[PDB]
Structure 1
Amino acid sequence: DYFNGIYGFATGIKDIMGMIFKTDTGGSNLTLDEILKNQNLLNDISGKLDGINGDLGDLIAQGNLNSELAKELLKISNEQNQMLNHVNAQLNAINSTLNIYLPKITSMLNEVMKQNHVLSLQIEFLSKQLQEISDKLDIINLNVLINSTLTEITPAYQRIKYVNEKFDELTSTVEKNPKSYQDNVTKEVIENLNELTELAKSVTKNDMDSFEFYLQTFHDVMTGNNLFGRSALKTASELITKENVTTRGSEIGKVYNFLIVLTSLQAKAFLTLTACRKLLGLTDIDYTQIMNHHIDGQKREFRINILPTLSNNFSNPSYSKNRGSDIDDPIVVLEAAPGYALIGFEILNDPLPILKGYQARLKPNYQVDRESMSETIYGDIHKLFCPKQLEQKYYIKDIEFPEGYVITKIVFEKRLNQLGYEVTANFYDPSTGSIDLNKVKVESWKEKSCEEDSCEDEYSIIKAETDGIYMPLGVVSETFLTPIYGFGLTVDEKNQKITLTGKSYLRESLLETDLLNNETYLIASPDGYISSIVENWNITSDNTGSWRANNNNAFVDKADTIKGSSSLYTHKDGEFSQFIGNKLKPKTNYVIQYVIKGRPAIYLKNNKDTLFEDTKNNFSDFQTVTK
């Protein structure tokens, strides 16, 4: 889909705040002290004692009675009235709560839960991405400046994340107003009461000499206003730009992703704080001003004194040894549509060595459209990238067109083990997102000798070893898909490994939109495929569309095995059907992939031949396979 960037995310959290900020509390003093499980018990006492006291008081009010006897009965009346009054006061507090407050609060809380979930879907991806980045970074040769920010930030971060997690989950697991926690029977008032009490205890603990201290200092450390002004942003930039971190996306991609994680953390925490306050009694505090101010400060930091220092150069994440060919002259063309543009690449090999290329239209300020995207798969790319026991000529250049142009077609040429290519760019307009089709530039030769003299020289060569040449492997793209203006190949035969590399517009793609607080539209790098011949292959909407099940043991069931995702469930006769014959061109290869749990029966049948069938593997936990 889309990721609307940090500014849009902040606007969303601010709208959630504006929602919760207003609704109601009536004051209602939600102090947990209320026993709240005797709303039945106290009522009996209140009723009986009321009857008794009324009878006796009316007997007195009859008058005409022995004076001292009247005094005695009046004192008894006073005592009973005192006891009954404090009892019914307690009951009245409890009942006023369980009628006026819990409906209101439950409604507002249920409302805040859903929009929180929606906004969490906006960073689910980058969560796991930063997890992966943390997995593949090493801090050898760190300076005392690193340990500085680490000790200056780690407790505040620990606790902010912990609170966000705890509260956000407790927003869900708290019974809603259907029960209304009413006196109905019991054990609803054990469990729902325990959970409500825990919510109460958590939110109470958020108004003291802490957690408005932790938030603020976290923001400060980010901006870099500590005792000797070293923004954790800058030290993270330094740590990431250190190599051995060769994964998807360039420097700017990774650091911006880091800042996304942290800013989302802070905004979530602000939301949680305001929710706590409203959940308690009074003195609402419009934090939106402080939150926006802090976010803008951190963004100003990132813009001014980190961004201009980073590279948009991005390389393949891994390599792979493969045996290719020499007797062939493979030629590969990756030509985007005339109104399209190249937006990154990917190399897979598990079915076979395959280069994949994405393409799409452009929105202003180097923004990509979600639709109009397309993935194209190509064949034995190794045979273009790998020899078989003979040397390989690789012309290596850092081809880059001037600004405003976008790489629009990359054609490869391998002629008698001489690997060159062709890079052609068109003109593009950042203000309108329009790409020109009548102002192009071409690059036929792939060295620096031709760069300075237009003469053929300065390639690099690889002497084919036995097992195979380390060919590129993985994804070739920024963390956010982005039209590239730089491209090149930089093979290092010193250890027989090849490497692709490009330069991305990401810097200018965001500097005009996000760090200026405008409607940003990025797209996280697609971890897997994005389209399929199988329409609605991503069954989740409880609707089959072109899918069809001719048996009630074959059902859609969004919660097939869990509500997390749908996966067409079939048991003992279940069959999901879909006519697909019209789209497969004859005598053409096709790759298949699917995430399956259990042992399903899969068939590609035209009632005469089953082009593929797998009915053997048993998968407990949704193993995906590709053939």
Structure 2
Amino acid sequence: LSKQLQEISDKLDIINLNVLINSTLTEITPAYQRIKYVNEKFDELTSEVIENLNELTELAKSVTKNDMDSFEFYLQTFHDVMTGNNLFGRSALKTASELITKENVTTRGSEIGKVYNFLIVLTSLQAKAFLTLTACRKLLGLTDIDYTQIMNHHIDGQKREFRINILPTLSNNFSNPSYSKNRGSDIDDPIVVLEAAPGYALIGFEILNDPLPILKGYQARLKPNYQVDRESMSETIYGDIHKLFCPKQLEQKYYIKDIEFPEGYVITKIVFEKRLNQLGYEVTANFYDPSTGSIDLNKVKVESWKEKSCEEDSCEDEYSIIKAETDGIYMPLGVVSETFLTPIYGFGLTVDEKNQKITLTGKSYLRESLLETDLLNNETYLIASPDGYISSIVENWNITSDNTGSWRANNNNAFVDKADTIKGSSSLYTHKDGEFSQFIGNKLKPKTNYVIQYVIKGRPAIYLKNNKDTLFEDTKNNFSDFQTVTKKFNSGVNPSEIYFLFKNQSEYEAWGNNFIILEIKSLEFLPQMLKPEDWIPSGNVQMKDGGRLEILGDGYFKQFIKLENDSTYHLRLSVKGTGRVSIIDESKYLLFVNVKDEDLTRVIKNTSSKGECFIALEGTYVENSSTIFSNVSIVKE
């Protein structure tokens, strides 16, 4: 009943607000509609000729006419309803701010930035309306009234209303919009560093699932006034972050750790730490001079997991427990970022195992990053948060214009279809011979995962090759208009010459653009006493690639690892082929286990150690099943 009453009380707050929107609409709608129509119909003049000029001259006569229902009347009433000079003292800015504060469900940016954007669209509408009114007076040949003074008084009074009665509200938290289910890792120990460049602070998170569970990141120089340098931005892409966040069939510990720092501190480094499914994360923020930019690289703080060290011996507390169901866990999906680019100072882990909702949350400087810039109207170097990849190994990744200096317009008829803004966006074009060559092999590394995005229309032939082998190719799926790919690939064993060749799928006409190529950082794990060199391949075997140690038929891999009589180890490993792991003393079986195709989760109690400890990674006596283990991890608890 108390929950039903809370849902009722929320419904009432939405209804009351909708009633206040209806009041402001009744006050402001006839003026807003007329201003909009006059602004739209005079666009060329404030930006068939005799007919359009006569129709606009008649419209100008209607606009400049000094009636009770004039355009000047509608401008004044719009200003009065905006400020709150009504019958009852309510302002359109107040009801709009109350609206945005309630319907901020799937909103990218903060309450300040949304309410300020609402103020910008209305102030621009009025400013264009005064500009069309001056243009109409000049077109008719009437005396100039100078509406600059009236327009400035109207704009400044509205900005003053916003600054005094609206802006002294908000927070600056941000999290992921959606969630994803992908069976992660519990066999491994995914440690992930999220560190900024020396001159940079980290400026956002992003979660992908369409190409793969992937962490996308940005980092850039920090300008004066907690604003960020555009051209110093960049992208970094990490591997299977479902394996960093989602557990698979075993529970995962999540160190809820709201690492936060005093003012001036900017996060130059985050490490995410998941050892034995304990998702802690060490973070190091540096300090930063609010003005003149120049993040200072000397005053750092490192609150790894130790916000509870100050109060409790069990600093191993301050965590959560997510139980891995058989399809994975609701890792974030989309983007943990702030509306406009700014240094984040705090971060915390905000998972929700009640719905498996793994949620990241950092603490940004955006409130500050704007309260001093547009509130003072000096420069407002404002760039909203991005959505896709801005960085690409492909140069002219989409196209700049009329110029594909990276590419090669090998054919004359295979020109660029539009070349100037006539076919939607910039896009390459190939037909009946078409091709576009661009050498990026010098920019491709052996054996590394790369995420690919590109937009294509029609009959395109995507190629990523060195005229001898193709790293990536798509010459199918004739599509309607410029659909986007977000997939991956692994760069070749020797891609030093692989160039991109956008061609045509057939003799038809092709279109494509937005070629995104960037590395996916292979997921790296915490080190444990297993190292591949001391392995002694014992019987028709050899060391493999994925840390795998094939057992061709029979035999094993052996290597000495010293177990202690007071320490616990955790052998976590899956096999491809029926295998036998072995923890045996000189005589007895400290463990006696066989592994067919599954993982291994072993918590060994006091390992009575008489010196000789090793593991014989053997298979079974079947000729076909080459026993191929997957992940060596003997992690010492």
Same fold (TM over 0.5): yes
Q: 1:224 to 1:143 in 2, by over 3 A?
A: same
Following superposition of structure 1 onto structure 2, how do residues 156-167 of structure 1 map, counting pairs within 5 Å?
156-167=31-42
Q: 1:451 to 1:557 in 2, by over 3 A?
A: farther
1:281 counterpart (122, 125, 141): 141
Percentage identity across aligned positions?
Answer: 96
**Residue 195 (str. 1) matches residue 70 (str. 2):** no
Larger Rg, first or second structure (1 or 2): 1
Q: Which runs of 5+ in 2 are unaligned?
A: 1-12, 488-637
* Counterpart contact for 1:317–1:473, Cα < 8 Å: yes
Following superposition of structure 1 onto structure 2, how do residues 145-184 of structure 1 map, counting pairs within 5 Å?
145-168=20-43
2:273 counterpart (394, 408, 413): 413
* Counterpart contact for 1:425–1:442, Cα < 8 Å: yes
How many residue pairs match? The answer is 471
**Residue 292 (str. 1) matches residue 156 (str. 2):** no
Equivalent-residue separation in structure 1 for 2:141 and 2:103 (angstroms): 52
Paired amino acid for 1:207: T
Equivalent-residue separation in structure 1 for 2:284 and 2:126 (angstroms): 44
Equivalent-residue separation in structure 2 for 1:508 and 1:559 (angstroms): 42
* Counterpart contact for 1:553–1:569, Cα < 8 Å: no
Paired amino acid for 1:195: N
Following superposition of structure 1 onto structure 2, how do residues 210-289 of structure 1 map, counting pairs within 5 Å?
210-242=70-102, 245-289=105-149
Q: Pairwise CA RMSD of aligned residues?
A: 2.2
Equivalent-residue separation in structure 2 for 1:141 and 1:391 (angstroms): 45
Q: Which residue of 2 aligns with 1:501?
A: 361
Q: Map Cα deviations across residues 293-316 of structure 1 (whole Å, 9 max, x no partner).
A: 222222222222222221111221
Q: 1:608 to 1:300 in 2, by over 3 A?
A: same
Q: 1:322 to 1:158 in 2, by over 3 A?
A: farther
* Counterpart contact for 1:421–1:446, Cα < 8 Å: no
2:433 counterpart (573, 582, 585): 573
1:214, CA displacement in angstroms?
Answer: 2.0
* Counterpart contact for 2:273–2:281, Cα < 8 Å: yes
Provide the secondary structure at the position in 1 that maps to 2:448: coil
2:64 counterpart (201, 207, 213): 207
Q: Map Cα deviations across residues 414-467 of structure 1 (whole Å, 9 max, x no partner).
A: 1111111122211111221111000011111176x4464473313221122233
Provide the secondary structure at the position in 2 that maps to 1:403: coil
1:243, CA displacement in angstroms?
Answer: 6.2
Equivalent-residue separation in structure 2 for 1:398 and 1:235 (angstroms): 34
Q: 1:170 to 1:620 in 2, by over 3 A?
A: farther
* Counterpart contact for 2:17–2:95, Cα < 8 Å: no
Paired amino acid for 2:383: I
Q: Map Cα deviations across residues 589-620 of structure 1 (whole Å, 9 max, x no partner).
A: 11222221111111111111011211111123
Equivalent-residue separation in structure 1 for 2:150 and 2:104 (angstroms): 38
Equivalent-residue separation in structure 2 for 1:250 and 1:410 (angstroms): 24
Paired amino acid for 1:312: N
* Counterpart contact for 2:226–2:290, Cα < 8 Å: yes
Q: Map Cα deviations across residues 278-328 of structure 1 (whole Å, 9 max, x no partner).
A: 222122122222222222222222222222221111221222223212111
Q: Which runs of 5+ in 1 are unaligned?
A: 1-137, 173-190
Paired amino acid for 2:58: K
Provide the secondary structure at the position in 2 that maps to 1:476: coil
1:477, CA displacement in angstroms?
Answer: 1.9
Q: 1:192 to 1:533 in 2, by over 3 A?
A: same
* Counterpart contact for 1:489–1:501, Cα < 8 Å: yes
Q: Map Cα deviations across residues 350-374 of structure 1 (whole Å, 9 max, x no partner).
A: 1001111111112111121111111
* Counterpart contact for 1:247–1:316, Cα < 8 Å: no
Q: Which residue of 2 aligns with 1:593?
A: 453
1:213, CA displacement in angstroms?
Answer: 2.0
Paired amino acid for 2:73: F
* Counterpart contact for 1:270–1:287, Cα < 8 Å: yes
Q: Which residue of 2 aligns with 1:480?
A: 340
Q: 1:374 to 1:439 in 2, by over 3 A?
A: same
Following superposition of structure 1 onto structure 2, how do residues 19-98 of structure 1 map, counting pairs within 5 Å?
none
Equivalent-residue separation in structure 1 for 2:373 and 2:110 (angstroms): 19
Q: Which residue of 2 aligns with 1:354?
A: 214
Equivalent-residue separation in structure 2 for 1:254 and 1:494 (angstroms): 31
Equivalent-residue separation in structure 2 for 1:274 and 1:451 (angstroms): 66
Provide the secondary structure at the position in 1 that maps to 2:291: coil
Paired amino acid for 1:157: Y
2:472 counterpart (612, 617, 620): 612
Provide the secondary structure at the position in 1 that maps to 2:193: strand
Paired amino acid for 2:63: N
Q: Which residue of 2 aligns with 1:439?
A: 299
* Counterpart contact for 1:542–1:557, Cα < 8 Å: no
**Residue 545 (str. 1) matches residue 405 (str. 2):** yes
2:289 counterpart (429, 433, 439): 429
1:481, CA displacement in angstroms?
Answer: 0.9
Q: 1:602 to 1:197 in 2, by over 3 A?
A: same
1:554, CA displacement in angstroms?
Answer: 1.6
Paired amino acid for 2:225: N
Q: 1:540 to 1:437 in 2, by over 3 A?
A: closer
Following superposition of structure 1 onto structure 2, how do residues 323-334 of structure 1 map, counting pairs within 5 Å?
323-334=183-194
Query: Which structure features the higher share of strand residues?
Result: 2
1:335, CA displacement in angstroms?
Answer: 0.7
The more displaced of 544-553 and 434-443 is 544-553
Q: Which residue of 1 aligns with 2:247?
A: 387
Paired amino acid for 1:144: V
Q: Which residue of 1 aligns with 2:264?
A: 404
Provide the secondary structure at the position in 2 that maps to 1:537: coil
Q: Which residue of 2 aligns with 1:80?
A: none
**Residue 144 (str. 1) matches residue 4 (str. 2):** no
* Counterpart contact for 2:180–2:330, Cα < 8 Å: yes
Query: Which structure features the higher share of helix residues?
Result: 1
Equivalent-residue separation in structure 1 for 2:81 and 2:282 (angstroms): 47
* Counterpart contact for 1:469–1:497, Cα < 8 Å: yes
The more displaced of 544-553 and 456-465 is 456-465
The more displaced of 457-466 and 358-367 is 457-466
Q: 1:604 to 1:311 in 2, by over 3 A?
A: same
* Counterpart contact for 2:342–2:366, Cα < 8 Å: yes
Q: Which residue of 1 aligns with 2:380?
A: 520
Equivalent-residue separation in structure 1 for 2:380 and 2:32 (angstroms): 27
Equivalent-residue separation in structure 2 for 1:540 and 1:141 (angstroms): 49
* Counterpart contact for 1:357–1:377, Cα < 8 Å: yes
Q: Which residue of 2 aligns with 1:322?
A: 182
Equivalent-residue separation in structure 2 for 1:164 and 1:212 (angstroms): 14
1:250, CA displacement in angstroms?
Answer: 2.5
Equivalent-residue separation in structure 2 for 1:509 and 1:430 (angstroms): 9
Equivalent-residue separation in structure 2 for 1:532 and 1:367 (angstroms): 24
Following superposition of structure 1 onto structure 2, how do residues 460-471 of structure 1 map, counting pairs within 5 Å?
460-471=320-331
Provide the secondary structure at the position in 1 that maps to 2:385: coil
Q: Which residue of 2 aligns with 1:67?
A: none
* Counterpart contact for 1:354–1:378, Cα < 8 Å: yes
